[PDB]
Amino acid sequence: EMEKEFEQIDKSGSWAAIYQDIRHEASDFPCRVAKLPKNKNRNRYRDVSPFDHSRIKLHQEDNDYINASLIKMEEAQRSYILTQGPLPNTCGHFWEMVWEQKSRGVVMLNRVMEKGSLKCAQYWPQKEEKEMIFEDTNLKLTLISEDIKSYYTVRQLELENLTTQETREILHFHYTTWPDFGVPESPASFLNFLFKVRESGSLSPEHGPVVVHCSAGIGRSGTFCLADTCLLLMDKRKDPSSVDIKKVLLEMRKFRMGLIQTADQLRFSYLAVIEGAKFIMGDSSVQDQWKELSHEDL
Ligand SMILES: O=C(O)C(=O)Nc1ccc(C[C@@H](c2nc3ccccc3o2)S(=O)(=O)Nc2ccc(F)cc2)cc1
């Protein structure tokens, strides 16, 4: 039990310090490409960059940069692409990357407007009849349906490569109630949503890595990937005792900087893992209780 560890860290009020040690221990690799001057206007934040070694390269000879990273969790045998919320000029790049990388699911953890600021471009069509064409990457996107729920929406989209005319279905999971630099309202609303993503098949190895983003692709994206991988590792071994959360977070930060932005987000990660563990160890009925506690209807 990371449970014991959780009570001791709480009991002695020391998340700030435990989170600070992750920060000082975390990895540091270069981001030369992200920092090229031709890429300035492809980055949302000056100080949030993909390492060169783990960046996703677009397949066009023009300029292959995008602010995204392949988090390849070897032992857990899942991968995720974490990326900033796209920008008015980089939405073509975004869906280029989804196409080239054979992603089936995009997980969006932020709202387009937060705290009065435009934190993400409006990169998917809000109405079936108003589809989008990205001239630059020669792709078309169209909203097929949506299922709107109290704190999250699930869209089904169709992505077409206009060159070849092949079409794919992309599922879009939008958590709408998670403040920037914040935590979800409970472990339950969080897990209910993670489980809906899992249940979609989007995270299968038959598919490319799921794309996860928030505004910068590190705080909230961090939090969600970390819990998913920890659950998964615990699931693989059917052994809570042997998942070390901080060390998994450190493994993740080898592929992208800054994953998990606050001590509270770290603490929440733990709660979410501890809570999810129940389902993974065979109490199936905990899933239904999360649907209830989360209040996904009205
Ligand atoms: O959508 C999200 O959930 C999200 O993750 N958002 C988000 C993340 C990071 C930042 C920027 C900050 C930052 N950028 C870093 C890059 C790597 C790791 C952490 C980072 O935090 S900062 O650099 O501007 N602040 C700072 C830098 C240095 C200091 F000494 C104090 C303070 C802004 C929004």
**Which pairing describes strands 139-148 and 152-161: parallel, antiparallel, or unpaired?**
antiparallel
Q: How far is the CA of 51 from the centre of ligand 1 (A)?
A: 15
3-state secondary structure of 152: strand
Helices (H), the chain: 2-11, 15-25, 91-101, 187-199, 220-237, 245-253, 263-280, 286-294
Q: How far is the CA of 47 from the centre of ligand 1 (A)?
A: 7
How many Å apart are CA 223 and CA 229, to the nearest integer? Answer: 10
| Cα pseudo-dihedral 193, 5, 286, 197, rounded to 10 | 20
| Domain count of the fold of the chain | 1
CA nearest 152: which of 202, 191, 207? 191
Task: Report yes or no: 239 and 230 within 8 Å, Cβ to Cβ.
Answer: no
Range of the domain at 259: 1-298
CATH code assigned at 157: 3.90.190.10
How many Å apart are CA 195 and CA 190, to the nearest integer? Answer: 9
Helices (H), 76-186: 91-101
Residue nearest to atom 27 of ligand 1 (CA): 47
Residue nearest to atom 12 of ligand 1 (CA): 47
DSSP letters spanning 245-266 = HHHHHHHHHTTSTT-S-SHHHH
CB atoms within 10 A of CB 220: 29
What's the one-letter identity of residue 130?
K
Task: Report yes or no: 297 and 150 within 8 Å, Cβ to Cβ.
Answer: yes
Would you call 31 a catalytic residue per the annotation?
Answer: no
Closest approach atom of ligand 1 to CA 85: 1
115: left (phi over 0), alpha (psi -120 to 50) or beta: left
Task: Report yes or no: 43 and 67 within 8 Å, Cβ to Cβ.
Answer: yes
Annotated binding site for substrate: 180, 214-220, 261
- Residues with a CB atom less than 6 Å from ligand 1: 45, 47-48, 110, 180, 214-216, 218-220, 257-258, 261
Q: How far is the CA of 269 from the centre of ligand 1 (A)?
A: 18
